[PDB]
Amino acid sequence: DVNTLTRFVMEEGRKARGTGELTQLLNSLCTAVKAISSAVRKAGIAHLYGIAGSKLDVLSNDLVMNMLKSSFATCVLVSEEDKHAIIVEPEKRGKYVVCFDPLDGSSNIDCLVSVGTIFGIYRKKSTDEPSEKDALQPGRNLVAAGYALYGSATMLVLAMDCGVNCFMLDPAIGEFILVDKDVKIKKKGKIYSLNEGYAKDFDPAVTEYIQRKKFPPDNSAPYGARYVGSMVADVHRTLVYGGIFLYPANKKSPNGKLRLLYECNPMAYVMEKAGGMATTGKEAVLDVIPTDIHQRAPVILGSPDDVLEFLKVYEKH
Amino acid sequence: DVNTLTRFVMEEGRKARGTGELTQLLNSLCTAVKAISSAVRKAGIAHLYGIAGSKLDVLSNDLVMNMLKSSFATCVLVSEEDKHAIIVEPEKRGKYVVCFDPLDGSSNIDCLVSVGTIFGIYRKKSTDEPSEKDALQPGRNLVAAGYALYGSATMLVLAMDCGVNCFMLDPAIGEFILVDKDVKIKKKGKIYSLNEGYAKDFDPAVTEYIQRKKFPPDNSAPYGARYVGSMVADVHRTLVYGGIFLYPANKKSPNGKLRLLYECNPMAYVMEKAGGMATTGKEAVLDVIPTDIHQRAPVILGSPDDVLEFLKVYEKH
Amino acid sequence: DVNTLTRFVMEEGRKARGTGELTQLLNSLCTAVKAISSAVRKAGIAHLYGIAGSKLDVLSNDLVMNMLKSSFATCVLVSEEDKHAIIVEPEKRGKYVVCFDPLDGSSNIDCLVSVGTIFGIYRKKSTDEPSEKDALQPGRNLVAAGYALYGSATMLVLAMDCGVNCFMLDPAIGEFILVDKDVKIKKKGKIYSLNEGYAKDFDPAVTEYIQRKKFPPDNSAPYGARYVGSMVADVHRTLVYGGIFLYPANKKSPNGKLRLLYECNPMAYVMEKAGGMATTGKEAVLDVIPTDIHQRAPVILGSPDDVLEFLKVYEKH
Amino acid sequence: DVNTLTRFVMEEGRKARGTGELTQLLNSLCTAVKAISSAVRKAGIAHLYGIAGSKLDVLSNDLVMNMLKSSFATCVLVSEEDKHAIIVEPEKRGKYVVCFDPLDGSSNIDCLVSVGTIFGIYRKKSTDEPSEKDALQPGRNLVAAGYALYGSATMLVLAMDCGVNCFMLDPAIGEFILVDKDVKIKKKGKIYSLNEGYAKDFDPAVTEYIQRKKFPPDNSAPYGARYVGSMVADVHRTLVYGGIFLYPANKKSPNGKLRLLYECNPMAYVMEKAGGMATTGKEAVLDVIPTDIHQRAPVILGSPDDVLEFLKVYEKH
Ligand SMILES: O=S(=O)(Nc1nc2cc(Cl)ccc2o1)c1cc(Cl)ccc1Cl
Ligand SMILES: O=S(=O)(Nc1nc2cc(Cl)ccc2o1)c1cc(Cl)ccc1Cl
Ligand SMILES: O=S(=O)(Nc1nc2cc(Cl)ccc2o1)c1cc(Cl)ccc1Cl
Ligand SMILES: O=S(=O)(Nc1nc2cc(Cl)ccc2o1)c1cc(Cl)ccc1Cl
Ligand SMILES: [Mg+2]
Ligand SMILES: [Mg+2]
Ligand SMILES: [Mg+2]
Ligand SMILES: [Mg+2]
């Protein structure tokens, strides 16, 4: 029997006999996504080209930014687009701290590559004045996380303590329909995703692992390669078809390139909630403890076996 | 000053003081794409999930199939989805033969990866009865070709003798707006796209080439890796950012995996019209001569220098 | 600062520290409206006309019907489209009884005239088994009522104890935006709306009133005539521009033609909540007490002064 | 077998082995309508209400204005929104003169009443320099005329020498689908449409006619009254259900209130092409000869019998 992101969220909140604050927060994020999805698909692009006569990275941030301040459920907001955390006005304060990537893979949107919105929701901890500090919780403290993928179609994957659920956006009625209830990732996959152009800077562990995929030692079948470049898209494929996604440290930043707060953590959390794993090589991504908000991190995630089979090789070095 | 795919096509046809048959054909293809784009984005998916109470590969084929027969400009139609060429009914016959892939990368649409529609338009040659034979012309005989990419947004790239033009689909008014006039590809790019999982079966030439990209000999900067798996998406990125896309022969079919008639040829033609190259390793893709309609072919295409730099290595072996 | 029907409803519910049952109910009705609005505008009509190869009164009923049973907030449902009240399955029962007109003015939808959805929500009273009886409450017992107008644009007018609010449907992002907060109707208007073809059967009171509008006795300016035929549209214009709408008893049914439960009551309630009036000639519409569910009623509603100025004449006879 | 406004227009043009200038003109008008329809339904209204942070009469005019100049098929353009005719730039000149009402019933768009776009297309006559004079042709000189109705759904009625055809706008794929081929109006209808608030100023003929409808002399059934106020909507209902629409001269302008060039003429032409009639009381609307471009005219149109039955009474006075 049919269900929607809204109906579904207020049923969970109303069942956990909660406040409703998280629900308001999520609903507001949902509206923002729909507005972003509309912009990403080139809503009224004909007008920009003078159909009547006479920056997407920004609009997205504003949508999420504005929609979240407006929910009265947020107090501190961190965004890949803002150098500093944003402190919600006093009258608009809520108990939640949100970290998000308004639009990811944006730079590559000229070639219409799948882009997406990532987000993480923590409950404010210290009773001090809400500040950037409140955002430095480890992914292990997430209350809910997820992302919206603007691909061939627009889907929103939401992971909460109760598991991971996928909602398809029906553009004809502007509603998110639940199409994959309590999702779980394959134990082992047949695909490895990473940028092999930096093959030159791969630390030994990584180079050895990739080698075992192209040329399986047990003379089995090789894995298939796939890398869209837009994380949301890659991680999502990893979640659907199973496999492993990698964006390790190298010659550049030995802490990876991806941002921990609003890129690695939400995805790790989703993965782990779906039965997968997310390690930085040394430790679990959700355990890492934030120092800076734009702090980076190495990430290897996906199907258990694959991530484990990685760590296996990681120790060997 | 604003222009659309329709306004633009009937201005070319009306300027070449032509019949208008090609125009009707293109317009019909345009409608089909809009209908496919709507389906790909999950138009009324809420209804499938019982919002009121109680296969995309197919729908696409039917849209294109029906829309083209209905144009009265086609006589013989070849589609990746039909084992045999389709012979248009006598009353609905036109002078054009069309080859198309209704939906490409379809199998990977579960993970919402960019998919697309590819197409090639030839003028019927022999005055015999229209038959599958009429479809066996070499890509060099194309009258027009192109593809529709259903990615973050829906774009339609159209290449004709007059060059290559890109139109963005404004979903708000269902019109294709011309946003990139007479496109031309970069001489050299900084990205190589291919499935490195079949690294095990790469003939020497390919392995050596990829090696020169990961580890540039002139100790320059390496290329970046990118492979979406969905041709339309990859080829399009190659056209926008420049670079090289490869899907060579191996242990499997030594004639590649891609279909020549409705995948390689249209793309080669677009590439060549934009100033790029499309070789099968031995010869230019547009020169190859069709034997079977579902005949396969190896493809290496993109920026000139890159394709040439490839062939350089190809001869070496 | 921006607000939506959802954000707005769950803020009222969450502020009245309520259950959330009413909220789920309203949200479900909201989804149904968006689905209906999509169908009314001819969503995928191209498919019905064989774009790929090979009743609205009903679809609307099913949407509302299904969406409401699915909310778990309804127990007894009455609809202009169902001869008998519908008793929600035990597992899906809620404390609310809903009366609605899935689509009004439907018969006149061939000429694309504004149509709309009307609805009334009562709280079940007797602790007996939910039955048709539970639906026989007087409009005075309404918990919330309203209607959705599918005109030049789709708007949803919601009236609750806290007043009447209007939400515009942004089709680009499928969200209902609050554009007219706590609405109130003009004291006196300059427009009278009714079907003057039945001038032959007007009881004296009505004929005299209309006369005083066409030929104002105080030799002032006449009122303007307007009658769309589709109630939702007429009543809405009455609410926006002010004035009076009439659909009195005559030679036919001396109880009017409009249905009391799901047409007159919701509108009366909205009117009265916006500062207007709704009388049957003898008494207030919200006071009338239901005998049959499809029971009819005479209605005169709109701006106070105008309705009063009517009753003035009504007594005179 | 499926057909669209575009496919249909370029089949007529291509069949009449014409230039294609009229086709380009119509196509451009079609794009403008789709853009207007999108705006009328409140496309991105959420943005106006600060969803991200921080006049329709005009936008419509600009759309049509710009889209027509851009077609290279117009030379002189008259619009209800421009005090003077507009002379297309030399490089953009075409052989056609167009008269249009970008948006009609606009003032009443606050109550979401059906609005519409009306248009008339004449072929420039004098070989002088294109000037306002070229627009003063009688409706009898029309090459094509029609209107777009933005009601419960968006339809475009197109009347040319070959008859009248109706196209429904499928918003899901932004295409106009032909749903009523070569339309013809009922000989006699059962509905009269006019503003009876001006009952006080009706010349005798009109008052007597209306009387014969409310109280049929042959003691038959009365006609039903209907008046939306927005011409496009009323005239369209008249065309679909049959009947008569009236907007006669009175105490105010004895030449009516409707504009002759871009309101009366297009509708008269459509009516007459559908088998109806359009008189000003004294003569046929299409015969009247323009003096001023914003010149007004009395109009009575619709089913033959009804219009005739009117004129019958008209002579009697
Ligand atoms: O803190 S909540 O927002 N509590 C809550 N949401 C409600 C929605 C309705 Cl309609 C009624 C009552 C609610 O309480 C919440 C939200 C979710 Cl996703 C899951 C658990 C909880 Cl605890
Ligand atoms: O064979 S055509 O279709 N000739 C043609 N198209 C017309 C469109 C109009 Cl509106 C009027 C006259 C036309 O002639 C054609 C179409 C294109 Cl894309 C480019 C060159 C030609 Cl040759
Ligand atoms: O009975 S309710 O549905 N109570 C309620 N709705 C909630 C929504 C959230 Cl997100 C959280 C708590 C809620 O409690 C309700 C709904 C409305 Cl329109 C107005 C007053 C009330 Cl009383
Ligand atoms: O003057 S036209 O525009 N001639 C014309 N239109 C064409 C479209 C195509 Cl695709 C090809 C040739 C054409 O010639 C024209 C347009 C219509 Cl609605 C009806 C008759 C005519 Cl005469
Ligand atoms: Mg990012
Ligand atoms: Mg394919
Ligand atoms: Mg009704
Ligand atoms: Mg007007």
XYZ file of C-alpha atoms in Angstrom, chain C residues 1-3 37-38 40-47 49-51 107-115 149-155 168-173 177-180 192 194-200 202 213-216 219-220 222-229 233 236-237 240-241, chain D residues 1-3 37-38 40-47 49-51 107-115 149-155 168-173 177-180 192 194-200 202 213-216 219-220 222-229 233 236-237 240-241:
140
model
C 9.169 34.255 5.413
C 8.065 31.359 3.154
C 5.607 28.675 4.272
C -4.671 18.681 -10.408
C -2.176 16.791 -12.604
C -7.281 17.736 -14.667
C -4.604 19.580 -16.646
C -4.273 16.571 -18.951
C -1.004 15.182 -17.579
C -0.212 12.455 -20.080
C -3.099 12.912 -22.498
C -0.702 12.274 -25.408
C -0.571 8.635 -24.402
C -4.017 9.462 -28.137
C -1.577 6.744 -29.176
C 1.736 8.571 -28.937
C -19.719 17.447 -16.366
C -18.705 20.867 -17.704
C -15.025 19.859 -18.022
C -15.385 19.406 -21.808
C -15.163 23.167 -22.135
C -12.203 23.283 -19.713
C -14.149 25.194 -17.081
C -12.591 25.571 -13.650
C -13.375 22.472 -11.580
C -9.747 25.082 -7.222
C -8.268 23.884 -10.512
C -8.522 27.152 -12.437
C -5.979 29.317 -14.274
C -3.744 27.929 -11.532
C -4.354 25.403 -8.772
C -5.097 26.820 -5.329
C -0.968 28.319 -4.371
C 0.304 25.132 -5.979
C 3.781 25.566 -7.441
C 3.692 22.884 -10.166
C 7.447 23.230 -10.727
C 8.255 21.807 -7.304
C 2.832 27.823 -1.072
C 0.968 29.971 1.455
C 0.102 33.146 -0.459
C -2.877 34.638 1.438
C -24.028 38.671 -7.760
C -26.463 32.719 -9.964
C -28.090 30.945 -12.911
C -30.684 33.405 -14.261
C -32.029 30.870 -16.760
C -34.258 29.628 -13.979
C -35.617 33.171 -13.711
C -38.972 31.606 -14.512
C -37.468 32.012 -8.831
C -29.012 44.513 -8.053
C -29.628 45.136 -11.781
C -31.628 48.272 -10.922
C -30.376 49.543 -7.568
C -30.107 54.743 -7.940
C -26.532 53.669 -7.309
C -25.600 48.060 -10.543
C -23.787 44.890 -9.525
C -21.955 42.870 -12.154
C -23.216 39.427 -13.121
C -20.950 36.382 -13.047
C -21.750 32.691 -13.074
C -19.254 30.020 -14.074
C -21.562 27.158 -13.257
C -14.963 28.680 -9.085
C -13.935 31.363 -4.740
C -14.441 34.540 -6.778
C -11.744 37.034 -3.367
C -13.682 39.918 -4.925
C -3.203 7.989 -35.471
C -1.574 10.647 -33.209
C -0.859 14.187 -34.348
C 0.549 28.672 -19.880
C 3.468 27.816 -17.571
C -0.401 31.404 -15.717
C -0.352 28.176 -13.650
C 2.183 29.765 -11.294
C 5.270 27.954 -12.528
C 7.860 29.000 -9.980
C 5.696 31.064 -7.670
C 7.545 29.584 -4.673
C 10.563 31.638 -5.594
C 7.731 33.987 -1.992
C 11.336 33.655 -0.843
C 11.833 29.915 -1.001
C -7.650 41.581 -14.425
C -9.835 38.745 -13.100
C -6.848 36.407 -12.651
C -6.817 37.036 -8.875
C -9.713 34.614 -8.599
C -7.955 32.126 -10.913
C -10.568 32.492 -13.639
C -9.802 30.946 -17.017
C -7.737 33.392 -19.058
C -7.525 28.843 -23.345
C -5.796 28.447 -19.970
C -8.638 26.762 -18.091
C -8.917 23.432 -16.239
C -6.363 22.421 -18.856
C -4.619 24.363 -21.624
C -6.105 24.064 -25.095
C -4.804 19.853 -25.935
C -1.531 20.754 -24.241
C 0.134 17.747 -22.691
C 2.155 19.451 -19.918
C 4.112 16.244 -19.213
C 5.873 16.361 -22.593
C -2.017 17.014 -29.102
C -4.781 17.198 -31.714
C -7.895 16.018 -29.874
C -10.819 17.500 -31.908
C -26.951 32.211 -23.507
C -23.695 37.732 -21.286
C -23.363 40.175 -18.373
C -26.921 40.815 -17.157
C -25.779 43.446 -14.680
C -26.020 45.919 -17.506
C -29.663 44.887 -17.865
C -30.419 48.526 -17.159
C -29.684 46.986 -22.796
C -34.620 32.708 -23.479
C -35.619 32.906 -19.786
C -39.301 32.597 -20.748
C -39.455 30.789 -24.087
C -43.474 27.492 -23.780
C -40.464 25.257 -24.280
C -35.533 27.910 -20.919
C -31.889 28.344 -21.838
C -29.258 28.147 -19.110
C -27.268 31.230 -18.142
C -23.462 31.201 -18.081
C -20.980 34.042 -18.014
C -17.383 33.650 -16.862
C -16.427 37.203 -17.724
C -13.585 30.912 -21.719
C -14.973 28.426 -26.043
C -17.911 26.989 -24.062
C -18.186 23.253 -27.450
C -21.708 23.100 -26.002
